[PDB]
Design a protein around this nucleic acid. Structure first.
Ligand SMILES: [K+]
Ligand SMILES: [K+]
Ligand SMILES: [Mn+2]
Ligand SMILES: [Mn+2]
Ligand SMILES: [Mn+2]
Ligand SMILES: [Mn+2]
Length: 135
RNA sequence: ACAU
DNA sequence: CGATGT
């Protein structure tokens, strides 16, 4: 119903899908950018949405913050819940970096605990997530 | 269909 | 119009 303003919002941006992928996390209340990942030459939207949530979990855990995370990706929220990113992206030499990062994110989820609620940003009611790339 |  | 996903 209502936005939980005391939260972290994350999103992917890309040039092509598959294509160059980046992501960032912002304070939902203020829009302040709290982290941004350097562009990865080839990935998918969903891989980037997944990495963004996992990075958010790690960022909040390191700072002892109980804030929830908002994501607009139904897929990535499920992959994080499952601790398994079921991407269709070919594993080859050009996708090795994104796949390394995804594998390492899964590995982190399988070796750490968190209570962080991972919440669906309701774009249909609230507009674009505050971490959106405006593109 | 829904979500990107 | 193309794509990634449940
Ligand atoms: K969206
Ligand atoms: K589809
Ligand atoms: Mn998104
Ligand atoms: Mn894996
Ligand atoms: Mn977006
Ligand atoms: Mn967009």
């Amino acid at each position: 119903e209502e936005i939980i303003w005391e939260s972290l919002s994350v999103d992917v941006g890309s040039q092509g899908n598959p294509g160059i992928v980046e992501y960032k996390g912002v304070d939902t209340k203020t829009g302040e950018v709290l982290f941004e990942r350097e562009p990865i030459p080839i990935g998918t939207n969903n891989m980037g949405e997944f990495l963004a949530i996992v990075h958010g979990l790690r960022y909040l855990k390191e700072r002892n913050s109980r804030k929830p995370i908002y994501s607009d990706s139904q897929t990535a929220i499920k992959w994080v819940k499952d601790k398994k990113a079921k991407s269709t992206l070919v594993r080859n030499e050009e996708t090795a970096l994104i796949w390394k990062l995804v594998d390492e994110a899964e590995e982190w989820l399988n070796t750490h605990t968190y209570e962080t609620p991972i919440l669906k940003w309701q774009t249909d009611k609230w507009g674009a997530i505050k971490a959106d790339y405006g593109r």
